[PDB]
């Protein structure tokens, strides 16, 4: 698995609130969180599917 698969949910400096998903290594699966709306990191997906296709083990 990559390193980015373990990044924290970085909302960004934007004060907006947008439901996004991320691989959460601290749970071991793809989960939802609130994201800001700028400076999206690698640890940021549009669905659990897409997260899985990207980083879902193998």
From Swiss-Prot:
Residues 5-55 form the BPTI/Kunitz inhibitor domain. It is found in: Secreted. Keywords: Disulfide bond, Pharmaceutical, Protease inhibitor, Secreted, Serine protease inhibitor, Signal. One of its GO terms (cellular component) is extracellular space. The record marks 15-16 as: Reactive bond for trypsin. The keyword Secreted applies. It comes from the Eukaryota. Disulfide bonds join 5-55, 14-38, 30-51. GO terms for molecular function: calcium ion binding; molecular function inhibitor activity; potassium channel inhibitor activity; protease binding; serine-type endopeptidase inhibitor activity; sulfate binding; zymogen binding. GO terms for biological process: negative regulation of platelet aggregation; negative regulation of serine-type endopeptidase activity; negative regulation of thrombin-activated receptor signaling pathway; trypsinogen activation. Inhibits trypsin, kallikrein, chymotrypsin, and plasmin. This is Pancreatic trypsin inhibitor. It comes from Bos taurus (Bovine). The chain holds residues 36 to 93 of 100 of the full protein.
């Amino acid at each position: 698995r990559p390193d980015f698969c373990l990044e924290p949910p970085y909302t960004g400096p934007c004060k907006a609130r947008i439901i996004r998903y991320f691989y959460n290594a601290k749970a071991g699966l793809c989960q939802t969180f609130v994201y800001g709306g700028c400076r999206a990191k690698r640890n940021n997906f549009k669905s659990a599917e897409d997260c899985m296709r990207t980083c879902g083990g193998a």
